[PDB]
Amino acid sequence: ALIENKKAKLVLIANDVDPIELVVFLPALCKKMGVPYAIVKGKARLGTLVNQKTSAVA
Amino acid sequence: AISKNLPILKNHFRKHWQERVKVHFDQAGKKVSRRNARATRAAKIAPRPLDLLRPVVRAPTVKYNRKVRAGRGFTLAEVKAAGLTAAYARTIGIAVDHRRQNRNQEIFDANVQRLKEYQSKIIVFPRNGKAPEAEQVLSAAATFPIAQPATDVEARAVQDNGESAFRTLRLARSEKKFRGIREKRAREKAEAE
Amino acid sequence: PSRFTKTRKHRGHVSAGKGRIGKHRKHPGGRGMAGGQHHHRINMDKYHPGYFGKVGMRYFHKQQAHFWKPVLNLDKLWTLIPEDKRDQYLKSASKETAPVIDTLAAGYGKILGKGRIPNVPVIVKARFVSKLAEEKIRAAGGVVELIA
Amino acid sequence: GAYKYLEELQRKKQSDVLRFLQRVRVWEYRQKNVIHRAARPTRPDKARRLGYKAKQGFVIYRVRVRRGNRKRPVPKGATYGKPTNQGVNELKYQRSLRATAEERVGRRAANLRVLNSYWVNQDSTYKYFEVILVDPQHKAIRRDARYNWICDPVHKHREARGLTATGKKSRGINKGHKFNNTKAGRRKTWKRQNTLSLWRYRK
Amino acid sequence: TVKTGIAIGLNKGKKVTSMTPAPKISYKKGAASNRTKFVRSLVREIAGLSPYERRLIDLIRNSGEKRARKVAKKRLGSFTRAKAKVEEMNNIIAASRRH
Amino acid sequence: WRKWNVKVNHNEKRYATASAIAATAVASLVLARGHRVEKIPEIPLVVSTDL
RNA sequence: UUGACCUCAAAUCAGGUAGGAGUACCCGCUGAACUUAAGCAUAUCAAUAAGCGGAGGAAAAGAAACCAACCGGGAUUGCCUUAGUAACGGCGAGUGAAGCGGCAAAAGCUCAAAUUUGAAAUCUGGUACCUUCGGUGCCCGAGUUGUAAUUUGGAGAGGG
RNA sequence: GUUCUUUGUAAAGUGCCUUCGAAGAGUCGAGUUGUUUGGGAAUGCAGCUCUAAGUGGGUGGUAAAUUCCAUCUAAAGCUAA
């Protein structure tokens, strides 16, 4: 929703989603709207940034 | 097998029909049980008449379009027309039909005045008030009978025009029948340049 | 009741009214409708001509309400008018007062000209009418009003 | 908003992107038991559409079932009757393949109550389904009147009796004319239509 | 819907003062929308076209339009889906040809 | 399934009830039934409503 | 090196639950043949008996991806009726519904798909106390691959 | 019917204007086979193969092409008598 409303300026994406379909569009939304994204290694490291176990996005 | 001068008969008894045989020997027994549960509910809901105000509705299927009959619910246009909300009307013994739609004003206003007459003749009691006893009656359908609308006046003039009203029926069917070819012939005739 | 049937009178008599040579048996000629185009032909032909074959065309999903058109004959046309409310109309062939007979309210879809109405003018409201029916009403002085 | 992209791609099964996903996924399923726990719904837009919630007490199980006809279990094709009952091979099993896939989990996880199920993958041999379970014994479902109905004892083994979406379809339970012979149940119609009624004052 | 007042004919029936009641919202359930059009757009972009979908562009380019539907008539279930599925592909051709 | 109850025309039940009502005022018939009405003043026997 | 995530295990780990019996009446699944056709093979018995799975006090069905073609009706169930009819059928033997009308009973509805993003607000479980079909304090966990709040097409949501 | 707590700086209903209004997929649907039906150029069901859509789709009991019209909202769910 943030990407659709142009309310994002940097997206962090985990590459380790076991179902990949949750994210295959995320690099695709970010370009067509114009948001820059970073596919970064690790949910467990995007997790502690959120104080969770996995986030798959940030 | 076949024999003296008798009609043919189709008697369907070649299955084990002897176990699926009902003889309601309970006809009188069920009747009394109905009349207890009819009153036992009437005590539990004491003031209310055991039924919802049902509307007046013109039947389908041209065989029966000629009479009018109780319907299922009050066609949200009706409950909003008489100035009341459906969620509350369902608490006032009004049956409301969320899926029926009004299409005839004479039928339409009949339900409005039916519902207006209902509002005058009912007494709604406060959730915290004294709630005085009000001598229930056991039927809204009895208190507001479904009366067939009056169609014509018993005396009128004679207006003869010579059309004989039979040629009208003969002409009509020829119009429903032959319309297609002369309307298709209309196109191909207009196709000339 | 059992005490009146001839079974009470067939006690003591061996065959019980079934014969000694015939010897009443289970189903000597086949059960049901066997032998129609076979040993029972003469019976079927003499009493049931038309029992085999087909005659016309089929019709799927029939409901008998499209052909619903109960008939009222022109002989009566008056049992619909109330009994005590009749005789003052038959004696007074008055114009601009003639009765309206709504056959549908009676339950009749068609009117046919069975015969000999009184010559008083009357207004009839009919879905359908017969040809000879319509002028016989009109020759009396009335008119038929098509209704739907 | 994520499910809306999940919904639409998951219907693009014959695109080069899912044909890779489809082909890879079927291999690991075939590499595991015929019926087993799935770690999570591989189709979250599908599971949650089918009543699933990511709450303690919803259970995931993947199933695979054998495909094709039902060969009649007669020794050497011996039917012992009339010619019309001589077929042995072209027999098609009126109950569906997911309907027979739910029953084995219900037998397996008997203390659970099946909610619904859906297709995940397939191959020539095995048709694949995920089955959504729910536990009436868990307090996170006993409360929350959204999901307290499944706790009622009339809802044991809903699939074996055929009360799921699989069975209600196989049983032909839908409104209108194309479902006359089975509208409230084919047997109940037959018994009602093949009963003769007699009153005290016989008509 | 103007009844003629007679049980037969073109507009058979008794004339009654109609009302034209309020629109039923469950008629545009299958009508497209803003969220619908956008997501449907991007899915086609990130998924591509099907093996049978590609054979649709291949045949429409080479040997004409009539048989494009005929192969679409069998490959799709109904014929009404075949005409639509062809026009979905002509839009792809127009989009690619512009670029 | 035997036929226990027998349906009787409504008009006949009304016919027969009127006959058995008209037969209550015949002392010849009432004596034939053995009702010991030899000492009754007259029939029909009507008493005041206070009964 | 250490700490996580995913996935998969183990335990006489804490708490549970399925089984078996009965099974007239219900929901499925499998499925005959005797018989009728004056033989008999499609047909009929019969979508039945036998066999298997699964419940309740009733079950099941149930609030239209319905019925109709009317001046439209309005969940489902059951009765009477439609009707031994439309239709099927070695068009033979035979089979065989439903809409319409009156009555019993009548009751409606809710989820998915929407950022709370100015704040995981949610839920299990553990422990102490208390007024225990439970409430409160505290603590891990589930939970961002979505648990609470908000709305269900008959609508409704964001603003004035 | 009697009484104690005020739940709540909360919730519901209601008129006019504006912008939207997401509504379910190995599913619908089609062919073929089998079985099933009263369902007829195919009533349901199931097997295989194919497998969509958004003024769309399902139905409208004679197959097909073209033009209209009516009525509902499936692939999700609860519910007494």
Tell me how many strands of chain D there are: 5
Major β-sheet profile of chain E = none
The quaternary organization reads as: part of a larger assembly
Topology order of chain E in helix (H) and strand (E) letters: HHHH
* Helical content band of chain D: 25-40%
Radius of gyration of chain E: 22 Å
Output the number of helix runs of chain D: 8
**Most extensive chain interface and residues per partner:** B-C, 26 and 44 residues
Helix share, percent of chain E: 55-70%
* Portion in strands of chain D: 15-25%
Query: What is the radius of gyration of chain D computed over CA atoms, rounded to a whole number of angstroms?
Result: 21 Å
Query: Biggest sheet of chain D: strands, sense, closure?
Result: 4 strands, antiparallel
**Structural class of the secondary elements of chain D?**
alpha+beta
Instruction: Spell out the helices and strands of chain D N to C.
Output: HHEHEHEEHHHHE
Shape summary of chain E = elongated
Sum up the overall morphology of chain D in one term. globular
Helix vs. strand class of chain E: mainly alpha
* Number of DSSP-assigned strands of chain E: 0
Proportion of strand residues of chain E: under 5%
PDB class: ribosome
Keywords: collision, splitting, RQC, RQT, ribosome
Entry title: Collided ribosome in a disome unit from S. cerevisiae
Chain A: 60S ribosomal protein L8-A
Could you list some keywords that capture this structure?
part of a larger assembly, 6 chains, A: 58 residues, alpha+beta, two-stranded parallel ribbon, globular, F: 51 residues, mainly alpha, 0% strand, elongated, RNA-binding
